[PDB]
Amino acid sequence: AMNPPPPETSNPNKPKRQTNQLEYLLRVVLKTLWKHQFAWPFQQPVDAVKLNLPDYYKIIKTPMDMGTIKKRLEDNYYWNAQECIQDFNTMFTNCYIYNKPGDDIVLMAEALESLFLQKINELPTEE
Numbered sequence: 001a002m003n004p005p006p007p008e009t010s011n012p013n014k015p016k017r018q019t020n021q022l023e024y025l026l027r028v029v030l031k032t033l034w035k036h037q038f039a040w041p042f043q044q045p046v047d048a049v050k051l052n053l054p055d056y057y058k059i060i061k062t063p064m065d066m067g068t069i070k071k072r073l074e075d076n077y078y079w080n081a082q083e084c085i086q087d088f089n090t091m092f093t094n095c096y097i098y099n100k101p102g103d104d105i106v107l108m109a110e111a112l113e114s115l116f117l118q119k120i121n122e123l124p125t126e127e
């Protein structure tokens with residue numbers, strides 16, 4: 001039924017950086033994933049209330065989604081690119097854990113992960 005508070009996206013106590021790698025993650029990596037036909041389930045936190053999933057947040061204790069990642073990039077939440085890459089991986093891994101191979105949702109996540117891994121590959125050298 002109830003949703004947990006979303007992952008943190010604002011914290012003036014957390015140190016942050018604006019870097020070319022983080023700029024790339026927003027302007028190239030998130031932009032490309034966001035517009036994908038399979039993005040929609042990943043654009044906001046899993047809504048246990050709306051989707052009637054009483055068990056989701058019992059199984060998934062570190063939830064993540066592109067809506068949260070988007071806020072984090074736009075509001076300069078991160079110290080480094082690795083932090084952001086970890087959020088994407090957490091999001092994919094959550095999906096694989098909660099669901100089973102060959103589920104539509106898993107196929108959709110797998111397709112997004114493929115685009116992601118490719119963009120991550122051309123990540124600029126840090127300045």
Ligand SMILES: COc1cc2c(c(OC)c1OC)-c1ccc(OC)c(=O)cc1[C@@H](NC(C)=O)CC2
Pocket residue numbers: 041042046051053094095098099103104105
């Ligand atoms: C009643 O409708 C929906 C209900 C759910 C989901 C969903 O998006 C595909 C829905 O469509 C709006 C769903 C959503 C997101 C997930 O993670 C991003 C997930 O792991 C898992 C899911 C769903 N599990 C699947 C698709 O096997 C269960 C909850």
